[PDB]
């Protein structure tokens, strides 16, 4: 089920990699980072940024939303670990 992660930026950044396919996914979370502290996980799909649904938006749009409030972001994410193929 989706869950909320509340991040406070560090000096370098948040410490995650966003990778776009369509959907945006957290491809990597840096050890010891704000992202890790917030319990963001690699593989999470990003559903909302700061309370706004981003499903359908481009990668650039979503990155802009993450940057929009200096220093903090809240990410509603869903970790999918089941897929029938």
What do these coordinates show?
- The chain is of the alpha+beta class.
- It has a single domain (1-85), classed as PDZ domain (Pdz3 Domain, Roll).
- The protein has helices spanning 34-37, 59-67, and strands at 3-8, 16-20, 24-29, 44-49, 52-53, 72-79.
- The strands form 2 sheets. A 4-stranded antiparallel beta sheet has the order 1-6-4-5.
- Strand 2 and strand 3 (24-29) form a beta hairpin.
Give the arrangement of secondary structure elements.
Elements: E1 3-8, E2 16-20, E3 24-29, H1 34-37, E4 44-49, E5 52-53, H2 59-67, E6 72-79
Antiparallel strand pairs: 1-6, 2-3, 4-5, 4-6
Descriptive labels:
85 residues; alpha+beta; Pdz3 Domain; 4-stranded antiparallel β-sheet; two-stranded antiparallel ribbon; 6 strands; Na(+)/H(+) exchange regulatory cofactor NHE-RF2
What is the straight-line distance between the termini?
20 Å
CATH fold category name: Pdz3 Domain
Strand order of the largest sheet: 1-6-4-5
CATH superfamily: PDZ domain
Compute the number of helices. 2
Shape: globular
Biggest sheet overview: 4 strands, antiparallel
Number of strands: 6
Roughly what percent helix? 10-25%
CATH architectural type: Roll
Subcellular location: Endomembrane system; Nucleus; Apical cell membrane
Protein name: Na(+)/H(+) exchange regulatory cofactor NHE-RF2
